[PDB]
């Protein structure tokens, strides 16, 4: 009984109009606006939505929504969290319906990141994904969930304890030499075939969210997205490259919210056997600075 | 009875030392030096060599070596060329041994590019390919030959006539809008599964050779090669991108000889059904100029 | 309309008893003795036989039996041979029944090797192969015929002309440096998926037959056969090794007749694209001399 | 929670220069020298290293490094060892960094063989394996670890108890008749798909290490390695052959340290169903003596 | 921890000479005679033997040998039997060596059938199976063990209890209408992929053994065996047919011992979901009577 994917996430923004154009044109996400005054939705697949975009916001993460298989796993995981001393709240029907899920609980991770556990997402099988721009392919979701995030943590061991309790596996996978003779350690945790769904280190961070990674089925879509960022003169924090752990081809670019999007292609299957690396396979060179990723990876 | 691959090529250079370091470090080719005063060899696979590098040169193409299956196809193709009015010379044993082939004929294509037809290459099965730097993978050769070239032509129809006679198929595949309201037409011809092995247009060219394309089995090797060009501050004429015909991910970078190398990955199978395009899938943006590829492809 | 396999061969021996023990114990062939005063048979598969062993012999080849698909190909190939000036004889029923074939013609190759062309071999489907010793596996026959032979030739070009007319393809595949500064050229020809079925050079030879190659399905059988030759102190002319053309693991050992047997495993598919080599992949070192294979291959 | 592969090993040598030439030329291993005064590394794959070669040594094993999946399995296995009465030491960070692992513990097996248990090896994905000589293929590592060793034991039952506790399975697989009417019993244990990773008997042994087996992906590399040993007149203790348990084609040759290397090809998958044999499939005949393997296997 | 196959069986006979000719000629088994005064062996595969044939016998079963995976399963199953009140004896080394196994225990089933449990059979990988007559194929053994037996039982529920404890699964699969208005119930139990390895009912039986089933890989071998029984005028108790449970094509014929052999082909995989039938798919008509199988199956 455990978390099985990153199901949805909630973000808040100061400029919904910018975000709509960004999501559709720069990424190929689908905008779904249900006429609600304070929010709209982004789709990737048959799910009613993967991302909720709240208005009047802080340009940061609002919540991560972690899926469990069904009510039995929901109830068991709640009691597990309670038993280990974590503070959780089981939500009422109104709150569950807000997220469009059958069961919902709210807590916060050890870093203060608002964390939701749910079962029973709404799937709109009648409404196939229709991307915000023409795409050669689609997104990799399914058993691997929407993507992955790096979020702020103040205590890596406590964060690891919490995510392990949720059913994640993983540990330190990068030891990065720093220009001070020190080492930066990044830990990466998986809960399904996606090489990682959550990752973190002890680094001071101005925002809850460092970056969100979204994966294309097709290299042609990743390339065109890269071209869109360049044509539109959008900051690329780390250039195209291949991480040693997940082995995806990715780059990192600015969002209208100032945290990074990592569009990518060809992520490898998660492994339970822990390894570490001291650098990337190639690329991911620093280009734009001021984003929390001034580290040497190749 | 026809040409079946680009088997070898000969180039001449002014700086053999630069070329050795370039081939090994920037590309991962193997240098084989047989102690000959005026030449060395580059390997890609079990062939004794794919490229002959002659010293004291012109920094351009010396010859293209087109393979036929055996002596019967050799003899039939010679008589075909003679019958259609082309000037060929069947080489003696000494000349054949120079190229390390069992049978050899020399002619020139309609653009003045020295052209060789041969059967029976020397394979050193005892000496497996050992790349000039560590590689994740290897090169795509085999049935597809060493790679592809764009070479100078003065008359596209005459060039097409000549290569069709050799057993190639293909025609105009790109019509590129030019800043003058004119169109540039590029023709691409295949003789095996490699999407193309020879290509050309009517464009004035300072050299016989515009570019040579070499294909990696592994994207990781292409990325690292791209990183090598950037770290070494080598001119990139056209940035990373995907052509609409061959669908390979490639970039074009300078050689010590001033003509371009196109390192690449994931070329599609040649098709006999002619199509045309007016642009690339993404990328291949102009970066360095002065190389004969100032055209808008995306 | 062409030759499709080496179907059977006839040999003559001075010591049938030695040959029986040799075939069964050292090789795992099946001895079938039909009570004929002057001959016995060796089986490899469901064929009534692959090898006829005649008594009172010369310890050399008596005939090679080349199969065509049926009577139409038989009649067409006969007329082809006649038309090109070769002397053939179409055999009567008694002669055909001697070889246990439906149609039979006799001629000699340009080297004086008695050569038979036939259609319609006798298959004893009721009598499955039962090897002369326990085997892990069986023999590779089927579409590839019984194996391959190197036979004496006095004129390589004439031999090539003759076998090409029979439907074989191939040419010079080895150029072997000799301790005299000279080169030995060996030509290898295929008529099916077996990398070669006949091979030859211009070398003076005391016998029609240099060696016969037989292929095991299982490496374990080849190893045990190698062990049998060693335990029985049988001459090994060339030690274990891998030829660059066929890529089989083989060794060459003496027969009671003084010509060599080449037991082997893992032969590659024949290719129509001619290549040449100047040495083997590894091994095939000279051990026993006096056998016509004192050449340096690794 | 258990050992999952032989991850690394440490050896000490009197002649590092000999070992470098041996590793590269005779075996095709990669030498990696990090400029440390007292040691260098041998690579087989993307791991930073598989073998540590310490200078100023005893020409024997220094340690075997057994990998577990992650920290949870590490902690559970430590407590398991403690609970069963074994003496272990959990290493500090400096000691862990020495081995380039995330967690490290040291103990000794019942035979006095220094034994390490670790999680989190360093993988240099940026630095693909580059063999010390040209290779047709590569090494079999991955889920099967670096290879297998036979090490000295004084009490087979105690050794079995210890390795079973570490998660290995296996028992007596060979009962070898001895020229004294006695029987030699060898036990073989697996911890993954490699047929065995550790093996032993009660035999008096002058060294900790009897032999190390390394596996090639390609038979052509094994043959060429065999040829290298012969050309360089290196002692072969047991000739080419196929063991009945693992079914690999192997030979055993001397190292500069006097213990044996067993280069091999085509190892079968480990089975949990115990069988025994009284001899090999073929070969492995004694050639050079004085190495602890004077036993009759075929 | 459980029984995993019928590994060997022991029978005793009054006429060893008849049995040798029967095994080889009528069935294609291999006779292996180790020069022991009182016994010989029958082989089916790489096992030293599957059947021990004791002389001076009773023309009935002597023992069934049930394999477990290794010593741990051996020790656990012994204690399980003891704990449930069964009488077992763990054998000494001399007794274990008699059966050529690493560990051995003896007991009797609830019907008085001597029952052995063992681990570690002797495999003669060096001595491939060599059938007693030419065969098109071989036997189905491997994970499915040697075959299956129906043995006498006096209490079906007690027999079921005992075999369930050994790790078998299965129950009543046939309810056969009898000419008395009664029903015969036969129970069939599996311990691997073989549809059943042991089967029984409450029927009075003059012998321990009703029949032994042996399976050919090839239908051609089953047909030829059927032809051998007919040509030699050997009693066929039940004619060719297909049972509804195992779905093999089989017949039942007399042995020199008077109990039946069931040669067969194409047995289906065992299923854990219990079904029953009231008749066969076709055939298995009574021919010879006096054998304990006078029941109507089609
Ligand atoms: O420990 C784990 C915890 C959660 C999920 C996985 C997983 C990994 C790959 C594919 C499917 C599931 C896992 O290994
Ligand atoms: O998906 C990923 C895989 C490996 C490393 C990172 C990473 C890069 C820079 C800073 C923090 C993490 C990552 O995002
Ligand atoms: O503030 C911003 C920061 C980064 C990107 C955009 C953007 C939005 C839509 C389309 C293109 C770029 C933006 O507005
Ligand atoms: O017209 C043609 C001429 C020469 C080669 C090909 C070919 C294309 C793809 C794969 C193999 C051969 C071809 O189509
Ligand atoms: O391989 C290729 C595929 C498609 C186009 C080109 C090309 C690009 C620029 C100028 C000329 C040709 C090419 O090289
Ligand atoms: O003139 C030149 C032009 C382009 C590249 C190189 C180069 C050669 C070796 C290594 C790196 C770059 C060079 O010398
Ligand atoms: O030219 C040829 C003549 C005769 C047979 C083949 C052949 C080769 C491989 C597989 C099947 C037939 C062939 O190529
Ligand atoms: O099958 C074969 C493949 C390649 C070469 C030979 C050969 C070796 C020595 C002398 C003549 C031929 C051969 O038999
Ligand atoms: O003259 C001979 C030459 C070579 C081998 C044998 C031989 C025959 C049977 C069994 C073993 C060896 C032989 O007799
Ligand atoms: O008992 C065992 C203990 C450890 C590993 C294996 C294993 C065997 C084959 C393939 C994968 C794992 C095993 O069976
Ligand atoms: O890998 C192996 C498999 C089977 C036996 C041995 C062995 C041979 C001689 C002495 C000790 C063990 C071995 O190494
Ligand atoms: O003492 C030694 C024992 C065995 C082999 C070597 C050796 C080392 C390098 C290259 C070839 C052989 C050696 O030096
Ligand atoms: O309950 C069972 C007990 C023993 C074996 C099996 C089994 C059946 C089919 C294939 C493999 C094992 C089984 O199902
Ligand atoms: O394998 C088998 C499958 C189904 C039934 C029987 C059987 C037939 C007659 C009497 C007793 C059992 C059998 O042997
Ligand atoms: O008593 C007997 C009963 C049944 C069969 C045989 C027999 C033995 C060998 C060959 C053929 C039949 C026999 O002897
Ligand atoms: Fe990421
Ligand atoms: Fe190109
Ligand atoms: Fe040969
Ligand atoms: Fe070994
Ligand atoms: Fe049965
Ligand atoms: Mg991971
Ligand atoms: Mg084309
Ligand atoms: Mg050939
Ligand atoms: Mg084992
Ligand atoms: Mg059943």
PDB file of N, CA, C and O in Angstrom, chain C residues 6-7 26 116-117 218 236 245:
ATOM      1  N   UNK C   6      25.637 -28.892 -51.904  1.00  0.00           N
ATOM      2  CA  UNK C   6      26.454 -30.088 -51.979  1.00  0.00           C
ATOM      3  C   UNK C   6      25.618 -31.208 -51.329  1.00  0.00           C
ATOM      4  O   UNK C   6      25.442 -31.229 -50.093  1.00  0.00           O
ATOM      5  N   UNK C   7      25.083 -32.113 -52.163  1.00  0.00           N
ATOM      6  CA  UNK C   7      24.102 -33.127 -51.691  1.00  0.00           C
ATOM      7  C   UNK C   7      24.741 -34.369 -51.102  1.00  0.00           C
ATOM      8  O   UNK C   7      24.429 -34.810 -49.975  1.00  0.00           O
ATOM      9  N   UNK C  26      35.109 -40.570 -33.712  1.00  0.00           N
ATOM     10  CA  UNK C  26      35.808 -39.284 -33.738  1.00  0.00           C
ATOM     11  C   UNK C  26      34.871 -38.159 -34.194  1.00  0.00           C
ATOM     12  O   UNK C  26      35.031 -37.020 -33.769  1.00  0.00           O
ATOM     13  N   UNK C 116      29.143 -34.545 -60.259  1.00  0.00           N
ATOM     14  CA  UNK C 116      27.822 -35.070 -60.590  1.00  0.00           C
ATOM     15  C   UNK C 116      26.769 -34.015 -60.292  1.00  0.00           C
ATOM     16  O   UNK C 116      26.881 -33.236 -59.331  1.00  0.00           O
ATOM     17  N   UNK C 117      25.768 -33.970 -61.159  1.00  0.00           N
ATOM     18  CA  UNK C 117      24.621 -33.103 -60.974  1.00  0.00           C
ATOM     19  C   UNK C 117      23.379 -33.992 -60.937  1.00  0.00           C
ATOM     20  O   UNK C 117      23.207 -34.878 -61.752  1.00  0.00           O
ATOM     21  N   UNK C 218      25.968 -27.908 -32.199  1.00  0.00           N
ATOM     22  CA  UNK C 218      26.324 -27.629 -30.816  1.00  0.00           C
ATOM     23  C   UNK C 218      27.828 -27.523 -30.620  1.00  0.00           C
ATOM     24  O   UNK C 218      28.590 -28.425 -31.001  1.00  0.00           O
ATOM     25  N   UNK C 236      46.502 -32.805 -35.762  1.00  0.00           N
ATOM     26  CA  UNK C 236      45.767 -31.577 -36.017  1.00  0.00           C
ATOM     27  C   UNK C 236      46.688 -30.688 -36.839  1.00  0.00           C
ATOM     28  O   UNK C 236      47.735 -30.250 -36.362  1.00  0.00           O
ATOM     29  N   UNK C 245      35.977 -15.144 -43.171  1.00  0.00           N
ATOM     30  CA  UNK C 245      34.824 -15.205 -44.061  1.00  0.00           C
ATOM     31  C   UNK C 245      33.598 -15.894 -43.436  1.00  0.00           C
ATOM     32  O   UNK C 245      32.577 -15.262 -43.226  1.00  0.00           O
TER      33      UNK C 245
END
